[PDB]
Amino acid sequence: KIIINLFAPNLPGSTKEDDLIQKSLRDQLVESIRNSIAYGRNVFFVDGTRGAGKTTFINSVVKSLNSDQDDVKVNIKCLPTIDPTKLPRHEPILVTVTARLNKMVSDKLKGYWASNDYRKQKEQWQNHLAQLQRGLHLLTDKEYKPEYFSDALKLDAQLDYSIGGQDLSEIFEELVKRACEILDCKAILITFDDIDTQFDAGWDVLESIRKFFNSRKLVVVATGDLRLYSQLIRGKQYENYSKTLLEQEKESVRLAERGYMVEHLEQQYLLKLFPVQKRIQLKTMLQLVGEKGKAGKEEIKVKTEPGMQDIDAIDVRQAIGDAVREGLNLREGSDADMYVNELLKQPVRLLMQVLQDFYTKKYHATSLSVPNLLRNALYGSMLSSIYRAGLNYEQHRFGMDSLCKDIFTYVKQDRDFNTGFYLRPQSESEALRNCSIYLASQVSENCQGSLSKFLQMLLVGCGSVSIFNQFVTELAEKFEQLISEYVAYMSVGRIESASHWANRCCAVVANSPNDEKIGVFLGMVQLNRKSRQHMPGGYKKFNIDTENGLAKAAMASSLSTVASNNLMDFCSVFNLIGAIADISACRCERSAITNAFNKVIAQTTCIVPPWSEATEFSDAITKVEQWLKNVNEIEIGIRPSALLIGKVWSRFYFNLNNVADQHKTRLYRNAEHGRMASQSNAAKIMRFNVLAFLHAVLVEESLYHSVSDREYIGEGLRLNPVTSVDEFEKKIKIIGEKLKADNKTWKNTHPLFFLLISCPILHPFIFPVGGINCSVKALNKETSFNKLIDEIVGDKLLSDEEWDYLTKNQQIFQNTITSLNSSTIVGASYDKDTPA
Amino acid sequence: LRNCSIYLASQVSENCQGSLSKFLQMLLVGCGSVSIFNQFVTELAEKFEQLISEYVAYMSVGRIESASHWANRCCAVVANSPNDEKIGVFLGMVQLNRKSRQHMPGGYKKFNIDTENGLAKAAMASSLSTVASNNLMDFCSVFNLIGAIADISACRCERSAITNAFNKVIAQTTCIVPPWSEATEFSDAITKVEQWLKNVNEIEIGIRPSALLIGKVWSRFYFNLNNVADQHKTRLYRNAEHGRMASQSNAAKIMRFNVLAFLHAVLVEE
């Protein structure tokens, strides 16, 4: 039961009483110290996580063993802690200990209890103190002088040095005994700090402990890195080898037995100095509180508000959990606890400062943008990791442009493009998995309350990683040159517009010459720009003028041109998503929408990446105007996350892999009007590519969205709607009934899917003329599928006349694509027929 | 190395103690990754340090999100090794066609997942893996099955975890070839699993596995899969669909002994 008040009048830099978390370990070590004395070298090694309060921990032990003086039978004074790195480069540790031990004795003597014993103790103390000074040359002699033998032959029976000679090990141990007699104790507890930042100075510490600090009345508590001591000890055993021997025996066989001996002297030197049973390991607060399920050794409570009673404080795991789920915008599931578990392995002071920097600023504001509060809390307490990993630390450029560059440079260092855009604390490097929580907060705070930013992170943020992994990385330092070219070409660092990124995506996925050159790529087809001859049936060239308003605009927004050996023309879902993101971030004014609307219609041509070998629309403008009225009032309740955006893309990115594979072998001669499952055309491919986007934003957004507590997909086996809309219709039907039964609304539970399904620009792509499987059994799902979409939006997207043409084998159509199916695809050979 | 061997044996006997999921992950990711490199990647090799780094980075050794995800990478590396006789009957896995092929004798057809029902559909989907080669390839594997068991048994009694464990890899995983490559029914299925997890949560507490047991189970299991992948690739005949005699083999029979190999190896060594 530990109560830690984040609203204490001081920062976590105060190590006050009842303010040390490692109290159980400290008393376990202190008791272990007393047991050894009560019974001749007692060396305790204190090790912990890098950057932990080991210096603070030993400084609590020195205070704990000095606070008690009459309650305990065993009395232990404690020299002030020694820092071997802040000492003169030539002062021996024996001098440093004696210098501090002398002041402890002198201060005790200056108490003036009585003059009867003051003189005797001073007389005897100054005898040993001055005798040690006589023998100090042996520590710092460069050669033996024949006159020191006279000193070694002087005998002082008043001093009682039994072994004989001038032995510094025994002179000091009698000096220590006088100190204990004067101070009325049983131990001295010499304490050392880390030998970091100068680990040459550690050899004096090791040599002094081995020779002078084994006296049954001295306790040593060292701390630091046992790796650093091992490199120190191993280096000295090589110094015991004669230089001539190493120059003459350099072969592998002679060097192996030389190294296999030093690894055996080093092994026993640590065991001699720091015994295994004496080594002390600081418990990280994850081990103090245990796992999520099982209880820990000791329970920790943190006060999240000022004035909370000790019975009102909540657990540290839930204190972090309330900050991770609300900060990273994660549901109360396994992935939210994945960040909490990693955060619990952080240094004790570092994490408790994160909680204070979060809750104190949260309480003051509440008296909101919680992800911004968590990002600020993570920024101050963790800024070293961001600097170490090369991320963007300048807190004035935090935006879409900076984050997407930080995501790509994190995945590059994480060396995992397959799943590096989830921002999960999996990386081995401490700095890298430190930035995972930081970037996750950055993703959740930029994209909060904005549909346009959600689609920008989906494409520029996560998509740029996936595009590189499948289409660019196989061509490859030479790898870093490709990385620099890819980020510069795709402009991940600077996002001019979402559709601008999409246009460069068409040219890079088409870089790889597809086998059989069918002309269908990842989420796109290569519509033919030059009318080729002898096309069976009604396979005419694609003409944008055929489509009317809201259909030509939908086509043009999805059409991109690539300047290659031929002026390649591409229709892709990516250009369609980029159009949605650009339009969604527009002012409600009529004219501002019109300016932004026409940008996607520019039919902009984009150059091949360098690593390669080389009013008519007035109806459409009104509908996209009314749609943005919903977006500007519904998007405020959107709470996306790195996991959500990553999961939505991952299914969507893999969905287009199936569609580009299943449909690449179904472009048959009689597929002018695709009505069977095995018949596919350009309209059908670009319908399921759009339907794939609308599916991943449905199932993966129902699973992972902070606004809704529980899922609505049901206990089903979720697959993707490829070659058939049966599976996409099923989930909408299943979710709708539960929402109706639970008295829930689509906009209040699926804000991301509701806006995109109600967005008019991609509405024609849902039901193209040639993309509807017009069978008997399958079309029954489609009729319900049309009604379910109409029920969600509330407006009948396709009326009876429009729908009756589609199902049953001219009227002017504007809310649907009318000429995509008849278009021919580059390289789509038409010399085969549908099987009978 | 003789000093780390006993220390590592204490690591394996500590993490895997009192758990069934951790035993399978140690068997599949720990022992499994060693054999996969030893027989399917080691032939391409300093060049070894970059091949070792390539293998570890690709398979995310030390970064496993789930054993099922490791199984997907296992399928790619096992498949992409140059195989004689050019049949997709690899070690512990069979490669099923994804595109319809004409002129197929008998009742043979491309594998469709929709025709299954209930628990069979869930288990069949859990054994399905995909790799993004020049063209998509679909595999049915026992390694995918074992990965599912480790993931399902690691969750709690809640139903939502069980259905998410089933829907963990199938439709949201894009496995790319390694850099060294040359190229309601379902409601009752959850009830059966959730009832099984109740047995697991009270039986696995007394499980005390060792690094020798886990190592021995894999060695017999890995050796068994070599025979099932060799004594069956020459038994794919026209009339072998039913497989009622010992001389006929097919996709269902191969995966019958691939799973039976796993269950036998566990029975013998344990």
Helices in A635-750 by DSSP H: which ranges?
642-662, 682-703, 726-741, 746-749
Is A826:A518 a contact under the CB 8 Å cutoff? no
The per-residue b/e assignment along A317-331, b for 16 or more CB within 10 angstroms, e otherwise, is bebbbbbbbbbbbbb
Question: Is there a contact between B99 and A711 if contact means CB atoms under 8 Å apart?
Answer: no
Distance CA B151, CA B147 (A): 6
Q: Are A75 and A179 in contact (CB under 8 A)?
A: no
Contacts by residues A732-741 (CB-CB < 8 Å, ≥ 24 positions apart): A732/A698, A732/A785, A732/A788, A732/A789, A732/A792, A733/A784, A733/A788, A735/A698, A735/A702, A736/A788, A736/A791, A736/A792, A738/A712, A738/A714, A739/A712
Pairing of strands A524-525, A567-572: antiparallel
**Where do the H-state alpha helices sit in A585-641?**
590-599, 618-634
Q: Beta A219-223 vs A190-191: how paired, if at all?
A: parallel
Do the Cβ atoms of A651 and B171 come within 8 Å? Answer: yes
CB distance B113 to B125 below 8 Å = yes
Taking CA–CA distances from B172, the nearest residue in chain A reads A651
Residues B167/B126, Cβ–Cβ less than 8 Å: no
SS3 A524: strand
Helices (H), A212-315: 226-239, 243-248, 252-273, 285-289
Q: What is the CA radius of gyration of chain A?
A: 37
CA distance A717 to chain B (A): 6
Shortest alpha-carbon distance between residue A654 and chain B (Å): 6
Do the Cβ atoms of B175 and B72 come closer than 8 Å?
yes
Supply A768's token pair. Answer: 């193209």
Distance CA A419, CA A426 (A): 10
Neighbour-count burial for A705-721, b at 16+ CB within 10 Å, e otherwise: bbbbeebbbbbbbbbbb
CB neighbour class for B57 (10 Å; exposed up to 12, middle 13-18, buried from 19):
middle
Q: Which residue, A226, A223, A204, A198, is CA-closest to A43?
A: A223
Asked if A374 contacts A327 with a C-beta cutoff of 8 angstroms, the reply is yes
Torsion of CA B142, B144, B150, B153, to 10 degrees: -90
Q: Which is nearest to A360 in space by CA: A429, A302, A280, A278?
A: A302
Chain B residue with minimum CA distance to A715: B163
- A799 DSSP assignment: -
Rounded to an integer, what distance in angstroms lies between the CA atom of residue B117 and that of residue A3? 54
Residue A105 identity: V
What sign does the CA torsion over A196, A200, A205, A210 have? positive
**CB–CB of A653 and B174 under 8 A?**
yes
Rounded to the nearest 10 degrees, how much is the dihedral formed by the CA atoms of A227, A231, A233, A239? 180
Query: Does residue A464 contact residue A404 with C-beta atoms inside 8 Å?
Result: yes
The count of CB pairs under 8 A between chains A and B is: 70
* Cβ contacts of B184 on chain A, cutoff 8 Å: 715
- C-alpha A807/C-alpha A772 separation (Å) is 8
CA-to-CA distance for A476 and A478, rounded, in angstroms?
Answer: 7
CA proximity to A186, closest of A194, A177, A195 = A177
Q: Which of A715, A723, A833 to mutate to test the interface with B (most CBs of B within 10 A)?
A: A715
Q: Which residues have a Cβ under 8 Å from the Cβ of A33 and sit 6 or more positions away? A: A42, A44, A61, A65, A76, A187, A189, A219, A221
Residues in chain A with CB shorter than 8 Å from the CB of B176 are 418, 469-470
- Residue A581, H or E segment: helix A573-584
Question: Phi/psi of residue B257, each to 5°?
Answer: -85, -25
> Which residues in chain A are closer than 8 Å to B170, comparing Cβ atoms?
717-719
C-alpha pair distances (Å), A177 with each of A113, A162, A180, A304: 21, 15, 5, 51
> Minimal Cα–Cα distance from B267 to chain A, Å?
31
What is the number of other CB atoms lying within 10 angstroms of the CB of residue B14? 10
Can you say whether the dihedral through the CA atoms of B105, B110, B111, B115 is positive or negative?
negative
Angle CA(B251)–CA(B256)–CA(B258) in degrees, nearest 5?
95
Q: Distance, in angstroms, between A207 CA and closest chain B CA?
A: 27
> Looking at chain B, how many residues does it have?
270
Three-state DSSP state, A317: helix
Closest by Cβ to B57, choosing from A415, A653, A657: A415
Mutate to test the interface with B, among A423, A717, A724, A728 (most CBs of B within 10 A): A717
Residue A570 in contact with residue A506, Cβ under 8 Å? yes
Tokens read off for A758: 């109600």
A718/B171 Cβ within 8 A: yes
Nearest to A230 by CA among A259, A190, A202, A209: A202
Query: How far, in Å, CA of B19 to CA of B14, rounded?
Result: 10
* Residue whose pair of structure tokens reads 């009102």 in the numeric block: A312
Return the percent helix, strand and coil in chain A, to nearest 5: 55, 5, 40
B187–chain A nearest CA distance, Å = 6
- Pair of tokens at residue A585: 């971030």
Where do we find the tokens 């141990």?
A173
Identify the DSSP state of A76: B
3-class secondary structure per residue, B191-236: HHHHHHHHHHHHHHHHCCCCHHHHHHHHHHHHHHHHHHCCCCCCCC
Distance from CA of A454 to the nearest CA of B (A): 19
Breaks (C-N over 2.5 A) in chain B follow: 45, 183
What are the residues of chain B with a beta carbon less than 8 Å away from any beta carbon of chain A?
Answer: 57, 60, 62-63, 65, 98-99, 102, 113, 121-122, 125, 132, 134-136, 156, 159-161, 163-164, 166-167, 170-174, 176, 179, 184, 186-187, 190
CB A105 within 8 A of CB A125: yes
Specified resolution (Å)? 3.3
Angle formed by the axes of helices A370-389 and A400-414, nearest 10°:
50
Residue A517 region by backbone torsions, left for phi larger than 0, else alpha for psi between -120 and 50, else beta: left
A109 and A121 in contact (C-beta within 8 Å)?
Answer: yes
Helix (H) or strand (E) holding A393: none
Q: Which two tokens stand for residue A342?
A: 């990693």
Q: Which residues of chain A approach chain B closer than 8 Å at the C-beta?
A: 293, 334, 415-416, 418-419, 424, 426-428, 466, 469-470, 474, 515, 647, 650-651, 653-655, 657-658, 661, 665, 700, 703, 710-711, 715-720, 835
Instruction: Give Dmax over CA atoms of chain B in angstroms.
Output: 61
Vertex A657: Cα angle to A652 and A661 (nearest 5): 145
Report helix, strand or coil for A806.
helix
Question: CA-to-CA distance for A163 and A180, rounded, in angstroms?
Answer: 22
Residues 6+ apart with CB under 8 A from A365: A373
Cα–Cα distance measured from residue A207 to residue A193, given in angstroms and rounded to the nearest whole number: 16
Can you read off the two tokens belonging to residue A504? 């460069």
CA A746-A750-A755 angle, to 5 degrees, is: 85
Q: Do B102 and A334 touch (CB under 8 A)?
A: no
Determine how many CB atoms are found less than 10 A away from the CB of residue A43: 23
